[PDB]
Design an enzyme around this catalytic site. Structure first.
Site, PDB file in Angstrom:
ATOM      1  N   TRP A 231     -42.167 -21.050 -15.765  1.00 17.39           N
ATOM      2  CA  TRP A 231     -42.420 -21.869 -16.942  1.00 17.39           C
ATOM      3  C   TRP A 231     -42.219 -23.307 -16.465  1.00 17.39           C
ATOM      4  CZ3 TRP A 231     -38.409 -23.665 -20.871  1.00 17.39           C
ATOM      5  CH2 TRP A 231     -39.031 -24.130 -22.013  1.00 17.39           C
TER       6      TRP A 231
ATOM      7  N   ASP B  48     -33.736 -15.863 -18.505  1.00 20.34           N
ATOM      8  CA  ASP B  48     -34.542 -16.417 -19.584  1.00 20.34           C
ATOM      9  C   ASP B  48     -35.259 -15.221 -20.262  1.00 20.34           C
ATOM     10  OD1 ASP B  48     -36.054 -18.058 -21.345  1.00 20.34           O
ATOM     11  OD2 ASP B  48     -36.849 -19.274 -19.756  1.00 20.34           O
TER      12      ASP B  48
ATOM     13  N   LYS C 178     -40.871 -16.235 -30.300  1.00 17.84           N
ATOM     14  CA  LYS C 178     -42.036 -15.380 -30.052  1.00 17.84           C
ATOM     15  C   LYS C 178     -42.031 -14.081 -30.880  1.00 17.84           C
ATOM     16  CE  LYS C 178     -42.714 -18.133 -26.412  1.00 17.84           C
ATOM     17  NZ  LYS C 178     -42.368 -18.669 -25.085  1.00 17.84           N
TER      18      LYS C 178
END
Ligand SMILES: *Cc1c(COP(=O)(O)O)cnc(C)c1O
Ligand SMILES: *Cc1c(COP(=O)(O)O)cnc(C)c1O
Lengths: 396, 396
Positions: free
Chosen positions: B130, B211, B246
């Protein structure tokens, strides 16, 4: 990794909530954190924010990500409240504002940005100020120096000590001013003293940073912003960290603003691109619910008119309690003439209590106050005024 | 102060939203930011979150400040999702979690804390990862090194290059792992490869940082957490930065978690007192709306059952689009066999597009994708599949 990590001390304001919420005495009294309590000891969710919330519930299509700077309506409304509806910073496209998680999130964003994009090394905070100021700025990597502010013997601002303190502040340093309702003292500059401070900033080269958290709590919304507007009319550049936690009763939703002003549209937009980079590397974009409740109330003529009735009712009730605390203290035995606390404005009374009177008051009497002697007048109700006044004088 | 501040470059993901939202072509296609779109090209607010919101609207008394670590119900639920309902880290009071503004706010809190309370200097992030990882950690003051991760010729994880990369990582360094649905590649370790990584972390002394942003998007909720749980069963200490942006569709409310685990109840509680100090100096306490919607859905048997139907429907539809993108590309002329993208999971396809094919696609065709070639498969609908497949092959 974690075996030599010593425990951190508790936060002076927030740690009080930790211990209160554990105290099993029926009659404890909170007086510590800066939350408004109403007639009944409740911190209700305002009606204008509950009506706006109904609205958002029916009229919301997506939870898709807000931009780094959040809602632009919010940004516009905030600028109008701070600077005037029809101001020159608005009209010259001189101001740019990012929506932040509370005034704390604003104050950190300012610090991160100044630390990485600027030559500034020092931030000057008032003696005494909000305890967490020091902690936000040292976290950014900046050092914090103190300028004399409050003369305890006479219970006033000591404007000469404040001038003379700052004369050893360099051009290029930040000097943080409290917009209105100084935390902890409740003592603010007279407008005549703010325009003095304003031209002295200019002649000397200090960058102003306004912590504006209690707008509407001193005299009124616009009235409260005069000092910042005396400074904005002379400063080519300044940053303001605004909070809507207090005046909207939106404490846990975290709605605040970081508004940056530079000499012209281009410079401010160039500088704001680095503020946005600092925001992306911290939390990515701001929490929408709080801020869109603000934008909805500030955008509706009717829902706005309901909110500033609610805000003036809050400002009045505290004034009534302030009266009450000094009357009830007089007839309850007080060793002193506390007639100076009627002079201070915002949610808080800075009494002369020592750290040991304050500690004794939580240990035998269970009334919780901050160790500096700052008591939250908004926490006082007609039902608790007498037991509390009695506690104070027994410790006096 | 602000006259030599150069403009920052735009963010690679968020800048796309800037330009899309300016493009006047009727037929542009977004494919860039990681937001789920439904059958109709809408990112709707889920029904389980709209029902929980009704709830909060009727049953909410105050907006008074949440503690630094937020809602404890939230903290409990999150630990159950991450570690197992009945886990040993739960049962030994080994884990502690703070509610943060999104996974980004979690990842920063971890960085601030490690930077100030720890000896760690380096954080190891996957090549590719990311883009904002680098930016959060350099902001904390930490440096970021890359470990080999994805073999582009075969379209797989290159486990030997990943082992050999990390052999020059010291004991004391952080190695950030992606929980599941690797961003950008979509390629994750096999559980057999995760337990290999888990004992290699142990023998070598690296601190794991997970993460976890796409839980529920690969195979299923619990299934997705196996690698972290292979690591949690062996690690005395680890930190996980969780996001509910999300899987709950709560992107703009900013709800995430930073959960800290140490060897025992005491060590973890001592370490968490410094995490709370870092949170107080950043934003003061977390935004409540997002997180209490999570806590309400996770706490109600019925509202929870509605949510994980909604989440599996999202996971299925993307699988259908993934199929669709490679079929429609084959009959539309594709120079390549894109049958590798059916193998990747989560919201994203890492295609082999070059930065210039990606730039051409936004400039003549208006389909917006990230410059690494990462396209958002959740953004594809049966109405836009054909114009998009056609755009890709004309640039191929
Ligand atoms: C209350 C207060 C803050 C915090 O604002 P939040 O919006 O709650 O983060 C900051 N500064 C001062 C002076 C305050 O009184
Ligand atoms: C989406 C994403 C994030 C950001 O999470 P927020 O909760 O939206 O802050 C962080 N890391 C990865 C890998 C992501 O995909």
């Amino acid at each position: 990794m974690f075996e030599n990590i010593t425990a951190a001390p508790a936060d002076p304001i927030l740690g009080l909530a930790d211990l209160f919420r554990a105290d099993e005495r029926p009659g404890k009294i909170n007086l510590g954190i800066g939350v408004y309590k109403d007639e009944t000891g409740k911190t209700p969710v305002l009606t204008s924010v509950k009506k706006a919330e109904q609205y958002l519930l029916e009229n919301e299509t997506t939870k898709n990500y807000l931009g780094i700077d959040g809602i632009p309506e919010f940004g516009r409304c905030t600028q109008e409240l701070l600077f005037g509806k029809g101001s020159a910073l608005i009209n010259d496209k001189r101001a740019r504002t990012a929506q932040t998680p509370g005034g704390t999130g604003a104050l950190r964003v300012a610090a991160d940005f100044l630390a990485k994009n600027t030559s500034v090394k020092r931030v000057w905070v008032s003696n005494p100020s909000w305890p967490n100021h020091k902690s936000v700025f040292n976290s950014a990597g900046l050092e914090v120096r103190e300028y004399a502010y409050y003369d305890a013997e006479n219970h006033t601002l000591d404007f000469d000590a404040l001038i003379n303190s700052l004369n050893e502040a360099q051009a290029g340093d930040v000097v943080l001013f409290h917009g209105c309702c100084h935390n902890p003292t409740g003592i603010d500059p007279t407008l005549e003293q703010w325009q003095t401070l304003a031209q002295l900033s200019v002649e000397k080269g200090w960058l102003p940073l306004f912590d504006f958290a209690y707008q509407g709590f001193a005299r009124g919304l616009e009235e409260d912003a005069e000092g910042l507007r005396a400074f904005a009319a002379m400063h080519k550049e300044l940053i303001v960290a605004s909070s809507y936690s207090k005046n909207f009763g939106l404490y846990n939703e975290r709605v605040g603003a970081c508004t940056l002003v530079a000499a012209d549209s281009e410079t401010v937009d160039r500088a704001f691109s680095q503020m946005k980079a600092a925001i992306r590397a911290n939390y990515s974009n701001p929490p929408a619910h709080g801020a869109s409740v603000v934008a909805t109330i500030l955008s509706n003529d009717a829902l706005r008119a309901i909110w500033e009735q609610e805000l003036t009712d809050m400002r009045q009730r505290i004034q009534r309690m302030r009266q009450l605390f000094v009357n009830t203290l007089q007839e309850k035995g007080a060793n002193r003439d506390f007639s100076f606390i009627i002079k201070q404005n915002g949610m808080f009374s800075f009494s002369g209590l020592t750290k040991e009177q304050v500690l004794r008051l939580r240990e035998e009497f269970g009334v919780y106050a901050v160790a500096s002697g700052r008591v939250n007048v908004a926490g006082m109700t007609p039902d608790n005024m007498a037991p509390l006044c009695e506690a104070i004088v027994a410790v006096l």
